[PDB]
Amino acid sequence: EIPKPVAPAPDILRCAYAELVVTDLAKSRNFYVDVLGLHVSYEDENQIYLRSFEEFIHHNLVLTKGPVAALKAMAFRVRTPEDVDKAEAYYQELGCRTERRKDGFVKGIGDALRVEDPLGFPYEFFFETTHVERLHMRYDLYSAGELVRLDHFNQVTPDVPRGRKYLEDLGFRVTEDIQDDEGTTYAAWMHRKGTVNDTALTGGNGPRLHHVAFSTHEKHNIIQICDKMGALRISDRIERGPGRHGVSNAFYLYILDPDNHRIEIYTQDYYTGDPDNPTITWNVHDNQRRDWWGNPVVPSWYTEASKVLDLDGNVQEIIERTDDSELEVTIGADGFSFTRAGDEDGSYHGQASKGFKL
Amino acid sequence: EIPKPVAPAPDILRCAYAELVVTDLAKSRNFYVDVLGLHVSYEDENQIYLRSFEEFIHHNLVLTKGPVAALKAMAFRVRTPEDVDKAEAYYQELGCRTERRKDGFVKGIGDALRVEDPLGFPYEFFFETTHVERLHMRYDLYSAGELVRLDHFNQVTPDVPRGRKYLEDLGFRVTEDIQDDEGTTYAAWMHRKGTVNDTALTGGNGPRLHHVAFSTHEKHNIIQICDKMGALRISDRIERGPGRHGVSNAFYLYILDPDNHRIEIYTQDYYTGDPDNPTITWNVHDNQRRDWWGNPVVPSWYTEASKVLDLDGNVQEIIERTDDSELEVTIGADGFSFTRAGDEDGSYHGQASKGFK
Amino acid sequence: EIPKPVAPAPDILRCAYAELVVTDLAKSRNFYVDVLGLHVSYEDENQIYLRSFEEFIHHNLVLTKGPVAALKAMAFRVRTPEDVDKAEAYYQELGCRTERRKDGFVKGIGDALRVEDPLGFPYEFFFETTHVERLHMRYDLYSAGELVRLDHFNQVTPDVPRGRKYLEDLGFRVTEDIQDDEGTTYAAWMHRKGTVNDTALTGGNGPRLHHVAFSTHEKHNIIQICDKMGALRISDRIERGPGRHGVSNAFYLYILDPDNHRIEIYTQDYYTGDPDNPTITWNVHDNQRRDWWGNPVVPSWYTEASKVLDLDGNVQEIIERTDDSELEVTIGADGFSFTRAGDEDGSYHGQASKGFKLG
Amino acid sequence: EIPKPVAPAPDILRCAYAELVVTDLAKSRNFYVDVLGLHVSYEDENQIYLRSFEEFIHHNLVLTKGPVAALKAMAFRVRTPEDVDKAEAYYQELGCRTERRKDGFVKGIGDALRVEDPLGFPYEFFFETTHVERLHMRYDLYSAGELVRLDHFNQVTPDVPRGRKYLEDLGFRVTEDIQDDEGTTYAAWMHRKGTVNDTALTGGNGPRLHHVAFSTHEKHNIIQICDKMGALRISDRIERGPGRHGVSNAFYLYILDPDNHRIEIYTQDYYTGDPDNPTITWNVHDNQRRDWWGNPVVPSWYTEASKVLDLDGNVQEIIERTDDSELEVTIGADGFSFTRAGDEDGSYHGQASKGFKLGN
Ligand SMILES: O=C(O)Cc1ccc(O)c(O)c1
Ligand SMILES: O=C(O)Cc1ccc(O)c(O)c1
Ligand SMILES: [Ca+2]
Ligand SMILES: [Cl-]
Ligand SMILES: [Cl-]
Ligand SMILES: [Fe+2]
Ligand SMILES: [Fe+2]
Ligand SMILES: [Fe+2]
Ligand SMILES: [Fe+2]
């Protein structure tokens, strides 16, 4: 288990931005700007800094050209400059590698701490950021698929309980999770800002980044992204969805960028900010837990995820999950899922729902 | 080939209602009234008469208790009372069995003709119907999933060109179809009322009724139906969707009633009323023709459909399709589909899209 | 009274396009293309030809540069080439001035007949038109405010029953109307294509063109047009709405182009194609008849409308309405409206709803 | 000026519920339940306890029968039981009257403090509450107009800067405000939970309660409430909207309950939780500030608001505003409003936008 430091945890406000390494900056720009409509805060020949429609901080997404596509940092904003000091002391006590730069790692961010966290992920903590024009009423720019906020990250890690304890000590509260009747945890979601999540853990080989999620205002905005991708004849880059989530209750869609980084589009989860917010636990065999409508979860969603980098820019070695696999127990050859607990009708043995096999 | 009568075709306005035989009336009522929110026009111990939010004719759906679930009649409204006489002469010349009831077959319909049509389907033609309160501004009754109009039927039949020519003679205009390069037709959509379809032909063993479709105002109304079915823990009765259609461009969902009758929910297709409305042909291997987003079509959509009855209420014998199977050529072991024509990236060989066999 | 000809009426399919004269073509282009997102079929220094997202005929709107902003033609497509000949005979029997051009008045239209109709309006009838790429699945182009179809026209004319009868003889069927208890008709809506209207008559001094209406898919598309106009700091060009209509049950908005031509954005009216479609008559004092939510009807809606041209391009003289004014009887100083018939609560006397009088 | 106490402010989570006094409990139930679709947690002959679709605390609204319709309490939930003690000490240092009930003022709330705050408003602070079934995935119950959360309160008070400083010391952050070029503040919005507001101050005679706001998921849910009010032939109870706000950028509607308590329906404001969230100041003469589309603000919006009670249940005396009136300076006789700053075209002199004047 990861011990709880004597040192006070930093006060984390929210997920704020991700830095993604991409291999072809122009192809990535085309996806994130021309297809998805994100707004350019700054760009040059090496990097593109993008923000959502309602953001005032410098960016939500940095695309950095590099040789290997990977997550380089997932950044959380802290409440005060002094919280960056707290973050540094906290991670030093945990025995984690840290690097602090008073003028930031990327443009538009000031004093920042990056760490290789106990699960192998590159976390950044910062307060100082360059404010930009908040585009929230720029309806002259508004896309029919407009991405309005950064919502969350989702991480793949082999041991969910181990990770969950560490994030709870850091101040995240678990909102929903997935378990079985045999003591296995498959996933958990946890928050600071009072939505279902700021980061989440998905059981699997890791460290890998499962996805970065952006919000829309309404469900039709998500539909429009799918319609546009059909019109562009890139529907093969729609991985899963659209649907209603069980966990989170949000309307959702998963798409893949040119380097196969998975982006979720997400809307209309619920308020979690009360400290006794009731925690919802689903059974892993409940076929409405991921897609509420019982639509099958494609195996690539379980198996594929992005590499992550260490502070030297090198790919982190992947550690294999030894706990049961959600894929195997639900849609594999010996898998099972149900629609109604205890009802054989609407249950699936050794295959996925709605008529499909792997 | 089905010859064109010399008798003038009835002037058909639109699809108007279906009569479905159901085995358990209370269970069926629960689905159509309590789940789907259709409005009761009349009921007793034997039948439930239901209508959509914007309808003024007596009903769009009649549920009739019987021993074997099946389509008993698919009904079209005609322009004038004299068009029922035309329909009778027309089908008599075709050599079809007909039955005329001057006082109707079901409540709220007057003078009506039922026929066993040349494709084996029980069609009704009528003009006279009891007007009821049009609920189109009754927002005090409006459901988050409200079904606002009856939109179309879809029929499974073995020989699509044969059926298409028969429907064209009857005045239906083809709007869209699916074909391959060898010249096989897999499906056609055709209309009277100036939408993408009033009835449609799906290639397969028939006569069987593929579905009845109702429209909503907006796409979120369809999402709500899915969400409601999840809450009621009957998500297993969501067969396919929700999705954007390629053919028709409509947003869609397919669900199954307690007797496995398939209901489509549908919104936002386009205007087809001009006589030179451009006809759209899709290639059968195009993975965006059915679901525009490339989601796979579940095999049950191609294989399962409702029995239909003859005028004595016995189940109509089925004729097997001998033309190529859309299932087999797209998602079966020797099938294939593409995202971009001529591109192996985003193509699927011997399985369906998105990772599924 | 306008007589019914012996000659058969042409079979009219639908409203198809309007030709509007505009005074500054670049300013008008900015409005219809950059603000509203209509699609250009053809343009030059003299004209801009525009279509909606789902259209396959050549255009829904022609902007023609000229000295005096006005309606030059409201055009209906007919079912067959021969229906143009029927239109010509029909209007010649009515004693109307007609002009026939075998190769069209505007680009992308073939054989066409323009008439100065018995109410002074320039109608066009045509069958032949150049087909274009139907953009209905071009979601790479789709705007958050996308205009998907042309829906209808609305005409201001002093004597509504006189015009209604003439349109009925032409095959248009009345769907809804607005009357009072003492027999005055204020407005009527009438269709060919199976929606609430293809053209409509608003009582007032005329001939003038009240508006041209385009459809969206959903209500939020209309909300976006408002939002965008706020962002562009042209909210003063939002005239009325958005709202829910009583008559038609459609969600709506009225906006003004650079020459004050009024454009309606409209969605989700109901099917009227059955021949016994039930007609709906509203009382003029029913404050839910126009805006169903009871929001006040802005006075310019009742007073302002576009000039129309005759076949020489000169403005048609205006004839004054002598029947009662809807403005006056509902929101003027002697006006009244109700929420519930017979209830003083929720009634308005000498002013509009929601606490406003006329400015 | 209201001094900053030495005692630490309670840690406030969010607005949580209001208790409104109503004169006819059945008529009020018809409005909030049958019209608006709120969910009944408990009721009897004297009270109705209601909650929104996504709520897990016992209620968001208590309707209490009494002789005079009024706000009885606006309630904020605090982070810990100990914050109720902090609240008591804080308000005692402010010199305010307070009342502490270990088992609650209303059913489903435990240990609770009510205070007559420095602006004369009855605030409640509590932590303990009975959890109920959270209905957030009960789509079998979901209405076409479903109210999904309680969002905020809005208070009418004569001196906005005085109130603003007090609420800032209590830890609310101002997100937007309306001012003019001559030093007057007409309104301010302020939050704890990371939306545009939890409570707000509107300049006017007070203390009075301007509104309680509930949110929906989507704009069409707000359209449906209007549509249903039309079908029920109660469109006279739609006061203002629907619209897009300038302040907050939310889609909105204002409606009136049977006692004229004003309810806002609200959706799709933006995230404010960062501590340096940019404060937006609108000029009072900007005609897109309140309705972004420039629709005129109905005069009753500026003049009418609910009475509020003291801790004895008596109506609080009203103190008149002496600062300039937003109504007067925008749509009154000497009013002015603009569409584009510095452009005469689209400006309005001595009347409202869109062709309207103030009714007599
Ligand atoms: O299978 C598909 O998705 C094509 C399709 C289009 C329109 C319809 O009404 C329908 O039932 C089926
Ligand atoms: O004024 C109103 O609100 C009534 C009305 C209904 C339908 C329309 O198309 C229209 O232009 C006007
Ligand atoms: Ca001043
Ligand atoms: Cl999921
Ligand atoms: Cl406001
Ligand atoms: Fe996610
Ligand atoms: Fe269909
Ligand atoms: Fe109109
Ligand atoms: Fe408010």
Automatic annotation (TrEMBL), chain B:
Chain spans, region Disordered: 342-357
Hydrolase keyword on record: no
Residues binding Fe(3+), per UniProt: H152, H211, E264
Signal peptide: none
InterPro entries tied to this protein: DHPA_dOase_Mn/Fe (IPR011981), Glyas_Bleomycin-R_OHBP_Dase (IPR029068), Glyas_Fos-R_dOase_dom (IPR004360), GlyoxalaseI/FosfomycinResist (IPR050383), HPCD_C_sf (IPR044904), VOC_core (IPR037523)
Record keyword Metal-binding present: yes
Protein name listed in UniProt: Homoprotocatechuate 2,3-dioxygenase
